[PDB]
Amino acid sequence: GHVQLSLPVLQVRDVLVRGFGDSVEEALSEAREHLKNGTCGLVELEKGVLPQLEQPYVFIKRSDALSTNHGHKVVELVAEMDGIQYGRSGITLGVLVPHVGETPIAYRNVLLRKNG
């Protein structure tokens, strides 16, 4: 189940603007909406990445809400200020950014929770 969705994958060094906003719930909402528009892209979480983003790093984690093994890499939209949790984990599949033409190197599919 869930909706299937794709995004581009951009370099954090081309993505001049990696903030959707400057609070958690802001960036989470705007992310959901830049996804709804389709003007979002993905940035992979690597060791030097957080202290180049703004702050409310809109993460994707592989849906810790289930107990089954048989599926695609499903994820869900989440956000943290210091990246206290999630970003500093191995769940976590990247951080979203507003796509402004930064030239992708790749694309990253996921599914997207839709209750009804």
C-alpha positions as a printed Julia matrix, in Angstrom:
116×3 Matrix{Float64}:
  0.0    0.0     0.0
  0.9    3.72    0.4
  1.46   6.05   -2.61
  4.71   5.6    -4.58
  6.69   8.79   -5.21
 10.06   9.79   -6.71
 12.41  12.78   -6.15
 15.67  13.99   -7.75
 18.92  13.77   -5.74
 20.95  16.98   -5.67
 24.4   17.79   -4.21
 24.24  19.83   -0.96
 27.0   21.96   -2.59
 24.72  22.98   -5.51
 21.59  23.36   -3.34
 22.31  26.96   -2.21
 19.01  26.83   -0.21
 18.48  23.72    1.93
 16.0   25.32    4.35
 12.3   25.13    3.6
 11.95  27.37    6.7
 13.49  28.07   10.15
 11.39  25.97   12.46
 10.81  22.18   12.48
  7.08  22.21   11.86
  7.45  24.95    9.18
 10.01  23.09    7.12
  8.1   19.78    7.59
  4.9   21.4     6.2
  6.58  23.23    3.32
  8.49  20.05    2.44
  5.16  18.13    2.28
  3.93  20.96    0.01
  7.09  21.18   -2.24
  6.51  17.43   -2.6
  2.79  18.14   -3.35
  3.95  20.65   -6.01
  6.9   18.4    -7.0
  9.53  21.2    -6.47
 11.4   19.18   -3.81
 14.65  17.21   -4.15
 16.72  14.93   -1.85
 20.16  15.33   -0.25
 21.93  12.2     1.04
 22.91  12.23    4.75
 26.72  12.01    4.92
 29.06  12.9     7.78
 29.79  16.56    6.85
 26.24  17.43    5.73
 24.29  18.77    8.76
 26.63  21.81    9.44
 25.97  23.15    5.9
 22.12  22.93    5.98
 20.03  25.5     7.92
 18.57  23.78   10.97
 15.15  22.12   10.56
 16.55  19.25    8.52
 13.42  17.65    7.06
 14.45  13.98    7.27
 13.05  10.86    5.76
 13.14   7.66    7.87
 11.96   4.16    6.79
  8.59   4.27    8.58
  9.14   3.07   12.15
  5.43   2.22   12.57
  5.33  -1.37   11.2
  6.59  -4.93   11.82
  6.98  -6.7     8.46
  9.95  -7.27    6.06
  8.42  -7.54    2.6
  8.38  -4.25    0.65
 10.21  -1.41   -1.09
 12.08   1.17    1.0
  9.04   3.03    2.35
  9.89   6.29    4.22
  8.01   9.09    6.09
  8.53  12.91    6.41
 10.04  14.07    9.77
 12.11  17.16   10.92
 14.65  18.03   13.72
 16.5   21.24   14.72
 19.94  20.01   15.93
 19.27  16.62   14.3
 19.29  15.29   17.93
 17.56  12.15   16.65
 16.96  10.56   13.24
 19.65  12.42   11.17
 22.16  10.91   13.59
 20.84   7.34   12.92
 21.11   4.59   10.28
 17.32   4.56    9.66
 17.13   7.85    7.8
 17.51   7.96    3.96
 18.31  11.7     3.4
 17.08  15.26    4.02
 14.7   17.05    1.65
 15.38  20.48    0.07
 13.39  22.88   -2.19
 14.48  21.94   -5.73
 15.64  25.09   -7.57
 17.28  23.64  -10.71
 20.51  22.44   -9.02
 21.07  19.65  -11.56
 20.46  16.13  -10.16
 22.96  13.3   -10.29
 20.32  10.63   -9.45
 16.67  10.07   -8.41
 15.35   8.35   -5.22
 11.98   6.63   -5.08
 10.09   5.92   -1.85
  6.48   5.24   -0.83
  4.38   7.9     1.04
  1.87   7.07    3.84
 -1.72   7.95    2.89
 -4.25   6.71    5.44
 -7.18   7.69    3.18
